[PDB]
Amino acid sequence: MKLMIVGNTGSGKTTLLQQLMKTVGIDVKDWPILVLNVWDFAGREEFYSTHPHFMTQRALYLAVYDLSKGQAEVDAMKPWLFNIKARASSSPVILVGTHLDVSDEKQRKACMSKITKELLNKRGFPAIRDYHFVNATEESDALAKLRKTIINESLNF
Amino acid sequence: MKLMIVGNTGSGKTTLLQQLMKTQSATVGIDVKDWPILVLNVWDFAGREEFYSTHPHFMTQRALYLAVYDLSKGQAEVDAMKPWLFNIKARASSSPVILVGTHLDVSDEKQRKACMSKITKELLNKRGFPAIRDYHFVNATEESDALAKLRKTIINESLNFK
Numbered sequence: 431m432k433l434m435i436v437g438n439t440g441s442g443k444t445t446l447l448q449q450l451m452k453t454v455g456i457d458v459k460d461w462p463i464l465v466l467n468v469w470d471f472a473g474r475e476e477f478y479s480t481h482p483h484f485m486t487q488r489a490l491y492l493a494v495y496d497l498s499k500g501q502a503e504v505d506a507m508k509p510w511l512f513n514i515k516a517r518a519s520s521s522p523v524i525l526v527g528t529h530l531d532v533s534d535e536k537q538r539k540a541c542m543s544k545i546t547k548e549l550l551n552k553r554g555f556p557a558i559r560d561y562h563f564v565n566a567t568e569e570s571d572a573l574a575k576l577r578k579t580i581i582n583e584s585l586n587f
Numbered sequence: 588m589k590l591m592i593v594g595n596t597g598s599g600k601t602t603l604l605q606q607l608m609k610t611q612s613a614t615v616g617i618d619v620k621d622w623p624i625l626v627l628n629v630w631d632f633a634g635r636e637e638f639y640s641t642h643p644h645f646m647t648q649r650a651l652y653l654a655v656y657d658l659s660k661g662q663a664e665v666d667a668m669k670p671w672l673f674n675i676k677a678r679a680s681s682s683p684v685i686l687v688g689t690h691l692d693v694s695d696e697k698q699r700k701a702c703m704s705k706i707t708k709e710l711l712n713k714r715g716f717p718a719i720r721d722y723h724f725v726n727a728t729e730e731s732d733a734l735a736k737l738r739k740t741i742i743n744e745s746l747n748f749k
């Protein structure tokens with residue numbers, strides 16, 4: 431299923447691949463011939479960063495959902511939270527509802543009540559550190575706050 | 588730090604990242620970007636099947652490797668492969684590996700004998716390196732018989748690996 435292209439930088443890995451199929455640290459492509467999931471690594475540092483330890487222990491999560499689709503999308507977050515918990519116990523999560531610009535207040539408050547009650551303080555869900563509602567298509571106050579929360583969480587982990 | 592962006596397709600994950608950073612599928616399944624602020628290694632998952640695909644079981648136990656070196660730099664590059672091979676071994680003792688020397692077009696005939704000799708006697712059938720299935724020498728920039736043989740080896744081993 432996966433084809434990993436490894437070796438040192440400048441050896442021709444990306445060039446070889448586009449020729450077979452006929453810098454970014456890690457490039458992930460599908461190759462239909464049987465479909466192979468191809469992982470193109472720039473060098474040793476990038477391969478090392480995929481060790482299961484970093485992948486499962488050293489990660490912080492943005493769980494993103496479309497608020498304009500209403501509280502069922504918040505429900506759609508539960509399977510994600512169980513999966514995230516199973517990858518790591520200690521994985522902190524920030525929930526982000528997008529499409530705020532095309533959401534009603536009934537939806538925003540319902541989703542928040544849902545979040546507050548059903549997701550916010552539960553074992554074994556991950557620790558959900560904050561939640562945000564944003565128009566993801568533009569710069570805004572709320573998006574800048576989300577940006578700061580992501581920084582604060584990365585530093586304090 | 589890794590930042591893993593998850594959720595279902597079309598929820599705005601890639602749009603949200605682009606906005607945050609301003610400071611077959613229609614979309615890439617997994618996109619991996621560095622974000623300098625502290626550098627965040629950001630992994631943007633299109634959806635559930637893509638996140639699933641990164642389970643450590645699939646990452647470490649369901650992977651075939653193309654181990655690439657520059658043959659115009661000579662037998663020292665074949666030596667450079669040994670650390671890679673120990674590393675691949677540590678992920679799964681069973682990982683199949685195909686070795687490929689590029690830059691054939693700017694290498695000597697002797698360069699290459701030395702590499703093949705080196706590969707043959709130091710890497711080929713060795714407890715515990717991984718399972719080195721084949722080796723090839725190619726100009727990676729063009730179609731060739733040699734590249735077509737490599738393409739075939741990849742199909743063959745992949746199918747055998749399944």
Ligand SMILES: Nc1nc2c(ncn2[C@@H]2O[C@H](COP(=O)(O)OP(=O)(O)O)[C@@H](O)[C@H]2O)c(=O)[nH]1
Nearest residue numbers: 439440441442443444445689690691726727728
């Ligand atoms: N002449 C020649 N140049 C090559 C060959 N393979 C790669 N290159 C050149 O090597 C350089 C590095 O290639 P790249 O594909 O970026 O290497 P990567 O870091 O391993 O992904 C590029 O300028 C390629 O065009 C080859 O077989 N022959």
Ligand SMILES: Nc1nc2c(ncn2[C@@H]2O[C@H](COP(=O)(O)OP(=O)(O)O)[C@@H](O)[C@H]2O)c(=O)[nH]1
Nearest residue numbers: 528529530565566567596597598599600601602
């Ligand atoms: N109106 C609006 N559209 C959004 C928002 N976030 C994402 N979109 C749109 O949703 C569609 C899918 O976004 P994309 O980033 O591809 O979602 P992904 O599949 O989760 O990566 C695009 O047409 C975006 O412009 C938002 O907050 N408001």
Ligand SMILES: [Mg+2]
Nearest residue numbers: 443444453472
């Ligand atoms: Mg490359």
Ligand SMILES: [Mg+2]
Nearest residue numbers: 600601614633
């Ligand atoms: Mg996307």
